[PDB]
C-alpha cells in the first residue's frame, strides 16, 4: 500500500504523532517519504545484516525481531512481519519507543534529508 501524502499525514495525526516528543507532524511525514516512499511494504536489507521494514523503516537489529539478524535486541517486543501492514499502528507504537530512547536521529533518512528543513511543507495543503 502506497499511502498518499495527506492520507499518511492524517493517519499520523489520528495515531498521536503530531508534536510527539516535540516533532511536528511534517517531520514524521517527511521521514516516510525518504525512508519508504510511503510504501507500507518496503523492506531494505542493510549493510550490517539487519533489515528495515515498513512505512518508517523500523530496524531489525534494535527494535523489531526477524530471526535472521545479528545483535537483535528486539526492544519493541514486536515481529518485523507485524510492521509490514497497511494500518500503521504497529509501526507508530514502535516509533514512539524509538523517538523516546536520540530523538528522530534514529532515522537516517530523517537526519540526512528532513532535519533542519521546512518539514511542515510536507503537510501544507492537507486539512
Amino acid at each position, epitope marked *: 500500500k502506497v499511502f498518499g501524502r495527506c492520507e499518511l499525514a492524517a493517519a499520523m495525526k489520528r495515531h498521536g504523532l503530531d508534536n510527539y516528543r516535540g516533532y511536528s507532524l511534517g517531520n514524521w511525514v517527511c521521514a516516510a517519504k525518504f525512508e519508504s516512499n510511503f510504501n507500507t511494504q518496503a523492506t531494505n536489507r542493510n*549493510t550490517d545484516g539487519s533489515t*528495515d521494514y515498513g512505512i518508517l523503516q523500523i*530496524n531489525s537489529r534494535w527494535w523489531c525481531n526477524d530471526g535472521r539478524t545479528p545483535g537483535s535486541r528486539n526492544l519493541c517486543n514486536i515481529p518485523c512481519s507485524a510492521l509490514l501492514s497497511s494500518d500503521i499502528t504497529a509501526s507508530v507504537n514502535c516509533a514512539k519507543k524509538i523517538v523516546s530512547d536520540n530523538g528522530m536521529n*534514529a532515522w537516517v533518512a530523517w537526519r540526512n534529508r528532513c532535519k533542519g528543513t521546512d518539514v511542515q511543507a510536507w503537510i501544507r495543503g492537507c486539512r
Partner: nanobody
Amino acid sequence: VQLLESGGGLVQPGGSLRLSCAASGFRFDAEDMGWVRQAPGKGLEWVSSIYGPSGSTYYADSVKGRFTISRDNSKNTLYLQMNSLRAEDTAVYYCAKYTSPPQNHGFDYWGQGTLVTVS
C-alpha cells in the same frame, strides 16, 4: 574519523587474502564495525560484523567458516582474513561503521573500499 582499507589484489581460486582497516578518530576498542562488499553489479552485501567490548563476531551465510573478522586493538586496525576465495567473492570490500547508533540503515559510514579479484 578515518577508515583506510588495504591489502586487496589478484588471487587465484582457493587462495587467501587478509584485508586490513586502519581506524582513527574514534574509540576502536568498543565500536561496532563490519565488512560489507559490493560485487559487480549487485547491491552492497554484508559480510561480517564484530560488536562491542565483547567482540561478539557474526558472518553472512555465504562466508561462514571461510572468513575471520578480528580487531587488533593495539594498532586500532580491523582485520578480515579471507580464506578459500571463490569467484563469487570478487568485490570491493569496505570497512563500515555507524555514525550514531542506535539507528536504522545499518552501517552508514565506510572507508574507500579495497578491490579483491578471485580469478
